[PDB]
């Protein structure tokens, strides 16, 4: 069949001070006590305190949990449901960045739904929705307060795992710009890179629709525009607008169309060596759309125009193959390394990474179907 | 401030098939009886009855007011409110086009918050959020399956009110292009040039954001594309799926971004005189437009281009012309009628009309602020 | 379905000199005695005795059947079989245009189904397949001695009836370019004409495949050339083999993709008035075009570049006026009436010849569903 | 003498599912038992046996040899005529690739004039036709479902002959996309550069027509767009479909207008070291292409344009040039060897090669008339 969905929470607020609005937001939907889960990052500057006044001067009780960690882990979500049944709460406001979100979702599904966070690997597993959850973003990139994905890392086999339910979209969102100025330029590469890469993988991928092409398309212009300024002078108010504005298109095109083999290898190399996951993102991008060049031929001739590169004369491989190269050059101009090589990745483990990516349920709508030995072939590209 | 909001259904099915899913929605909701708000001529067809079976056979009790009118009146609403409420029920669910839809959500309303649907109109005027409604849609322009939207008719002021509250928003959406091929033409051709008024007023309103431009402009070229198409031959399943998805970016983008002057006039010619509200925009439109040109040349310029049209070696203000003009042929092309007073319209109420278009909630977003004088001049223009 | 089928005699001989081969192959099928069906212009000019020599000249039998009359008659086919089982033949050989085609398929087919050829009007009516059929063809237009299409005219009913079935595939097809030069300028110029009206109509049918496709796009581009070298001297061999090829690509692409509206008219003003096909096609063809325009105005923007006219610059909607404006300009300099008024019709059987259109099978592919106030404009516009 | 002919099975089934009518078709010819001739792959996945239930659900017997080699050899035909006669068998049904209807083509014919398959290596060797025969494709190249050439495999010269007979024209062909899904991507790459080999020696070939040249160029221009995506995912069903079509188009082109010495080359290279087909002629293509340049500049500079490249500011010359770059790239972007000595062929051979592709059919109608010299450079040129 022809069919397909949309998934995003009902209401989603932007701007500049929309979280002064998350107190009464919490208190409109009946909940009484929210677990804040954020980062130790965020923690240790007082913005979870920040937070924790707006609701508290709405009726609303807080018990802060701030110990997910970048690339959360099942431990974590352990730890962070039973604060949540010993503190007696019966909601969870999740902010910070793509982390502190899963985390939420993953205690807020296993919350309602009791099992463990790894039995839910995979898509639409679940059987109950999670607890009522208002998410507020501080990143440019994920867009988890809008997705239905919540990446989990599994210790043991030391794999990210993508758990994909419906069960799992946000109460409400809240995209407050003015709680990202303080990303450190190397976190704004990373973030609006994992969003560019949402916005490709989701143009290409099998599962893209009229209106996730409309999203993604205007993601990729504007994070080819503000992007740069934004890692430039981070205290640039329009480009962290327009970046926040990128990347919940990003996160509206691909939690509905897909993604693709960037993020089933991503997530295990951030499984195996804890790297940021836009930095992967940024380093696979080229070699998998390289990859990927033969399938979607026209689509990357228009990702070529999308950002910028003048396409003019040129068969439509000459132009998919700019695209290419104007994604290297913006990786290297947000000063991207140029391997993992590099970061401290092995090549013994190679062989285990790309069996784990292809069995990520990103890899199921990337438009070029591999064997074994060309996932291989890619990891091995982005040694160099 | 520059804060800003996008409100939309949790869940949005499509896709050949998708009513084969409302039962089991229905049941997942935990309601127990819905009310089925359809039209008369989609009633005489069975489509109510076929609907009914899928409802029931999930454990769901249905009883059928199949009332609403093309312009659904107060009183349909009042109609609407005993039956469900003799019936005990405790949702609503609407198959039809943009009538069915506002008659469900404004009965949903007022069943949820007392008083009568006139006590609404303006902006966020309710206090509860409306029962829990379902929307299957079966034409291919509104967008009200998705939408904060309900116009329905004031009788006694011959005026199409326009309640534009968040409470309104349906609980789940369906757009099942297999109900839109049985569209006459002349439908098809109201529909459609209704949604390209939508994602128009939407890429030109005061409260466009890059995320409801992303959705018009991608309505915009679908429109422009398929809908001549579809009205030429209703059979043509791939023209109507473009439609459903034309149609339904175009409520995504007008819901968030705002209307403007043509559908303010459009009210009121349609509460004056009962015209079919497409046809009343698809007459008003170039007006509308050319009054406006002032205020967003580049912008029109730009909808010119999504319309097809060649604009090389022009000025901006040129290019904006050919998008008047490129208006004006789809219009004929699709007969449209030339004037309104052909079909009714009397110019001895050209003033009551103007001052109630200064009162509708679309008028707020137009990017060109008029005076009484130059509302009436628009709808003089009209007439011939 | 996403089924089609390619239907054609399985040997077709093209070049000057191939029908030398028609007593052999005659041969090799076994059969023993063949009617020779004709027309009587060729008859009294002596091609079918020059052809029945070669044809004796291999050991089977000939009687000649010399009156079947341009727009060929349900009292044409049954004198033909008369003869047929008077005569004792096993086979039909028809030398001619497409009245000697049609005349012979028809025969054949009563031959074997045994009803009335009225019977059989309509599409895959028959249950048995004819007797074998050679056809050699004179004429630069029709097609049929591959199609499956046989257009008998209905006396009583004065209406030109469309027999589509399979069973009058011919079995042999022989295009010997040599008898084609004594065409006249006025035949050359309507057969012409009839064949670029199948290949438009063949090009934007709703049951056009990427074959018929490739045969269409051809022919349209070797008659755009040729066509007026042929009319301008008929003692042009290379205008004469060329137009040849391209009516044979044009029968198989209409033959296997579908005719239109032109055709179904056509047959209506021929079937009143004895008016030439290829006039009546060439008379209607840019009305329907228009008409046509909104449902395939890509395909006419290319038809305008296969017809040689530069598109550069433009919509696609003002490229597919200049392809018919090509088409006015073409019909006009083969010197074909501007409308049917003065050559006898009459403004009283529009009505009648509009509904009679509406059930002819070509109607059943033109790409926009009309109604019947549309097809009486059409003929309307076609009558001045 | 100009003349020419076109040769086909006069019915041709398309589009998925076509497969479900081959039991009917079975009926209409008045068979009444069935040699199923398929390879140990296809009867072994399960295939074999579901159409031989369609076949016998129609009142049909089957028996299934499942024998045939990829490169049928005499040894196989002679056993499938055993087969044949010791089962009392009428008719042949081929399901599969070339190897497949090769195969069922040379037993039918050896079963109908009783020679052996060597004696009718030539053209138009045989003098009866051959016992009934429906062809099921599910390959996208070889187009033998339609053609009069037989390619069956001499053990002991270790050549290919190829029997181009006008009785081995198939009694009817079915061409069901979703039987191709399962080809793996490198037999899709292989078949599908077969496919366009064909329409490129059809489209420089002496003896082109315009009806081939038609059907070869659109071939050329629905390869250049899907094989690399039929390649890159064999589930995509729009780019099969397209395949299906497109070597469809190259089979009916290239049977009435001849191959070229990249057939003739590679026909005697598979030969010897049992390469697959398409693999030696996509390796072969180019450097016989170069040959070839200046005896078709103009065509080849088409062809470009055909494949997608840009010739705007030059020379005929370097137009064709980039056509043959487009040809290497293309096989480079779907694995093929760039040589022939890593896949194992031998120096002591070149000439033998060479020697005995100066003596195959396909090598008549090559544009350019070589010298035994130049063939041998080829050969020697296609080993780095
Ligand atoms: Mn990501
Ligand atoms: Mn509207
Ligand atoms: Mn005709
Ligand atoms: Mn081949």
């Known amino acids: 069949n022809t069919q397909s969905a949309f998934f995003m929470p009902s209401v989603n607020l932007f701007g500049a001070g929309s979280v002064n609005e998350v107190g009464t937001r919490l208190a409109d939907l009946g909940v009484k006590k929210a677990l804040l889960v954020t980062d130790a990052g965020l923690h240790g500057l ?10 508290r001067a709405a009726g609303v009780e807080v018990s802060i949990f701030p110990k997910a960690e970048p690339n959360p882990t099942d431990k ?7 604060a949540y049944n010993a503190e007696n709460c019966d909601s969870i406001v999740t902010l910070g960045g793509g982390s502190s979100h899963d985390a939420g979702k993953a205690i807020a599904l296993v919350a309602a739904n009791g099992g463990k966070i790894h039995d839910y690997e995979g898509v639409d597993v679940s059987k109950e929705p999670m607890v009522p959850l208002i998410a507020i973003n501080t990143t440019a990139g994920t867009g988890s307060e809008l997705t239905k994905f919540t990446i989990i890392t599994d210790t043991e086999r030391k794999v990210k795992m993508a758990i994909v339910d419906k069960h799992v979209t946000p109460t409400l969102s809240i995209n407050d710009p003015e709680l990202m100025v303080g990303m ?3 976190l704004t590469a990373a973030t609006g890179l994992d969003a560019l890469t ?3 993988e989701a143009y290409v991928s099998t599962g ?8 993604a398309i205007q993601a990729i212009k504007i994070i080819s ?9 981070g205290k640039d108010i329009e480009a962290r607008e327009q970046m926040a504005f990128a990347q919940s298109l990003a996160g509206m095109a691909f939690n509905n169309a897909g993604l693709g083999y960037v993020h089933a290898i991503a997530h295990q190399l951030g499984g195996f060596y804890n790297f940021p996951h836009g ?5 696979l991008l080229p070699y998998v759309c390289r990859f990927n060049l033969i399938s979607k031929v026209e689509r990357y001739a228009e990702i070529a125009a999308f950002l910028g590169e003048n396409v003019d004369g040129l068969s439509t491989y000459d132009a998919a193959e700019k ?3 104007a994604i290297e050059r913006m990786a290297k101009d947000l000063n991207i390394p140029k391997g993992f090589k590099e970061l401290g990745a092995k090549e013994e483990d190679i062989e285990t990474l790309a069996k784990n990516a292809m069995k990520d349920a990103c890899a199921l709508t990337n438009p070029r179907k591999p064997k074994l030995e060309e996932v291989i072939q890619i990891i091995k590209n982005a040694m160099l």
Chains 1, 2, 3, 4 share one sequence.
Do not use: F, M, Q, W
């Not at 974590?76 to 039973?82: C, P, R, Y």
């Not at 930095?279 to 380093?283: I, L, R």
């Open 46 to 55: 007082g913005l979870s305190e920040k937070i924790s006044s707006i609701i």
């Open 76 to 82: 974590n979500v352990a730890e962070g449901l039973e």
């Open 184 to 186: 450190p330029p190397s």
């Open 198 to 200: 949402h916005a490709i």
């Open 208 to 215: 893209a629709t009229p209106i996730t092409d409309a999203l």
């Open 225 to 233: 525009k503000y992007l740069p300024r934004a890692v430039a002078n």
């Open 279 to 283: 930095v992967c993102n940024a380093v």
């Open 323 to 325: 695209a290419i190269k």
